[PDB]
Amino acid sequence: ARKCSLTGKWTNDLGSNMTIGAVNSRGEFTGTYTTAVTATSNEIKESPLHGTENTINKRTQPTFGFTVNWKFSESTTVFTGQCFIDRNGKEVLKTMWLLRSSVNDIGDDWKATRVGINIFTRL
Amino acid sequence: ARKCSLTGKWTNDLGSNMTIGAVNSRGEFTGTYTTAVTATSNEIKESPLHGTENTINKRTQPTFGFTVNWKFSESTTVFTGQCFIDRNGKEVLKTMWLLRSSVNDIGDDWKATRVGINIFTRL
Amino acid sequence: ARKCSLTGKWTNDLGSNMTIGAVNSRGEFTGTYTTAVTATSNEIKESPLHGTENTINKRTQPTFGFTVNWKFSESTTVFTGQCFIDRNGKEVLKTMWLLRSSVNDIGDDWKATRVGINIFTRL
Amino acid sequence: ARKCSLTGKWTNDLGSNMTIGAVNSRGEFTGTYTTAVTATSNEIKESPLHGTENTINKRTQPTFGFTVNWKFSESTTVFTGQCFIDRNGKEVLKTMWLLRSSVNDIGDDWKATRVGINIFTRL
Numbered sequence A, B, C, D: 001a002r003k004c005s006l007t008g009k010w011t012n013d014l015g016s017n018m019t020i021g022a023v024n025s026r027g028e029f030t031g032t033y034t035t036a037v038t039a040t041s042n043e044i045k046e047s048p049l050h051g052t053e054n055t056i057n058k059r060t061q062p063t064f065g066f067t068v069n070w071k072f073s074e075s076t077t078v079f080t081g082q083c084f085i086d087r088n089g090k091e092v093l094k095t096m097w098l099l100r101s102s103v104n105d106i107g108d109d110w111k112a113t114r115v116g117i118n119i120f121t122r123l
């Protein structure tokens, strides 16, 4: 009964939000990612995401990955992590991400990758 | 300087291979990821991948990300990186990945993410 | 805005604790890292750490790195991050770490590095 | 007889060089790190490093960590990895690093960490 499900509306520790739709039988899902300029805030861009959740042993707490294809930049971010629960109740996504910037010369590749985390909860 | 195109067959610094199909107008692509060794032999599994290439400014050396949904484990890997024309003229994908393992308790989350790199050239 | 000083006793989001001593004029410091749980109990090991704080522009919120030389394993961890005065006034260390495991064959190197984060507040 | 030893002069895949001195009985060592501006090259800065190598089971291929306290910036880099050998002969250090930039507001923390690799060989 305690299936952690990616589908729905999520927010995070930096105040970014994401929506993910139905995950099919192969574990594929699409979504949207907002973001989060200045002021507030400032004002919001919306970016597409595509990923897969791992279906091996139809786990209640599966691992997943997804790519955010940023609309306001040449950058790409990948997130990977796991859907947990958590003492009710509360579903939580613990992710790690890599943010790739575009560089012009391959000589600059070494500096093009940031890493960090995101914890997501239901909105 | 012409394009660096993700479509085709690639190999990497650890001897794994990947094939990527056409990238559509939204930057989407599917493919396959063939890995090893674990032997002796018992060699080659084949896992699906799905990703997107960034299209902002229709760059000749775009960034991209993809998720590999492992068939032989509960794990997921995400790659992100950039398609370069190396100094020598050859196309090269410089990537970094995050390999997420499935843990049973959210207390074991801290240890679930490996990181590394992969450099891909055409087969 | 006053200093953010590494010297003192810290705790973190996973319940591990660390003590750091004086930082000398070159930015050097030693300390201790107390971790757990592995139980039941069999609880607390104590491992040495050694690091440096960056002193360029004698910043109030300097960056730093340190290496923890684990006593109970062959592994090494490195932390790096920054000492902030949080919005609430409290000192906080935001860090990222790389946990390197010992492997026997250089063919197993690709899998030897975990990554994550730790947020430290004063005990 | 095949002890991989950190002490000496090393170069890397980006053309940076490092010298490390004697490692004591607790595994501590100091060194220097050059770097590598422009042109060539361009011209070289030299930065101090401090780290430890793990002594548990006096391994022939120990893991280590070290911090580079950059002299020309507010940044800090930590490297961790392992000293291998390799079919002679050839000692090789396979490292992963995190490069922390200084940011002014904790709101900007999420973007302050780059990750990458370095392979080092004897000069």
Ligand SMILES: NC1=c2[nH]c(=O)n([C@@H]3C[C@@H](O)[C@H](CO)O3)c2=NCN1
Binding pocket: A014, A016, A035, A036, A070, A073, A075, A077, A097, A098, A099, A118, D110
């Ligand atoms: N300017 C950019 C950003 N500003 C921001 O809050 N993000 C968020 C924060 C972090 O959740 C995730 C990393 O790519 O995306 C940005 N990504 C990419 N580029």
Ligand SMILES: NC1=c2[nH]c(=O)n([C@@H]3C[C@@H](O)[C@H](CO)O3)c2=NCN1
Binding pocket: B014, B016, B035, B036, B037, B070, B073, B075, B077, B097, B099, B118, C110
């Ligand atoms: N046992 C596993 C592996 N053995 C292997 O070579 N790989 C490769 C190497 C790396 O490209 C990619 C995930 O990092 O998959 C494995 N991934 C996941 N699991």
Ligand SMILES: NC1=c2[nH]c(=O)n([C@@H]3C[C@@H](O)[C@H](CO)O3)c2=NCN1
Binding pocket: B110, C014, C016, C035, C036, C037, C070, C073, C075, C077, C097, C099, C118
């Ligand atoms: N078994 C190990 C551990 N259990 C643990 O809580 N840690 C902590 C968590 C993290 O702060 C730091 C290395 O990542 O050490 C361990 N490190 C290394 N090995």
Ligand SMILES: NC1=c2[nH]c(=O)n([C@@H]3C[C@@H](O)[C@H](CO)O3)c2=NCN1
Binding pocket: A110, D014, D016, D035, D036, D070, D073, D075, D077, D097, D098, D099, D118
């Ligand atoms: N401007 C900077 C650099 N230019 C450079 O080549 N490096 C090198 C490359 C990479 O080996 C290591 C990462 O900090 O240090 C720099 N580090 C830090 N800052």
Ligand SMILES: *[C@@H]1O[C@H](CO)[C@@H](O)[C@H](O)[C@H]1NC(C)=O
Binding pocket: A011, A015, A016, A017, A034, A035, A036, A044, A123
């Ligand atoms: C996230 O959604 C919440 C709920 O409506 C909203 O208050 C906030 O504006 C959102 N943040 C962003 C970046 O859109």
Ligand SMILES: *[C@@H]1O[C@H](CO)[C@@H](O)[C@H](O)[C@H]1NC(C)=O
Binding pocket: B011, B015, B016, B017, B034, B035, B036, B044, B123
């Ligand atoms: C990768 O491709 C080559 C063909 O060039 C094949 O012979 C090799 O064994 C492949 N490796 C894997 C793991 O499939």
Ligand SMILES: *[C@@H]1O[C@H](CO)[C@@H](O)[C@H](O)[C@H]1NC(C)=O
Binding pocket: C011, C015, C016, C017, C034, C035, C036, C044, C123
């Ligand atoms: C950390 O510090 C507290 C004292 O505030 C101590 O009671 C706690 O159990 C410590 N944790 C570890 C792992 O030492």
Ligand SMILES: *[C@@H]1O[C@H](CO)[C@@H](O)[C@H](O)[C@H]1NC(C)=O
Binding pocket: D011, D015, D016, D017, D034, D035, D036, D044, D123
């Ligand atoms: C590394 O040392 C070599 C050997 O002398 C030298 O050619 C090169 O100038 C060095 N690179 C840097 C960044 O100092």
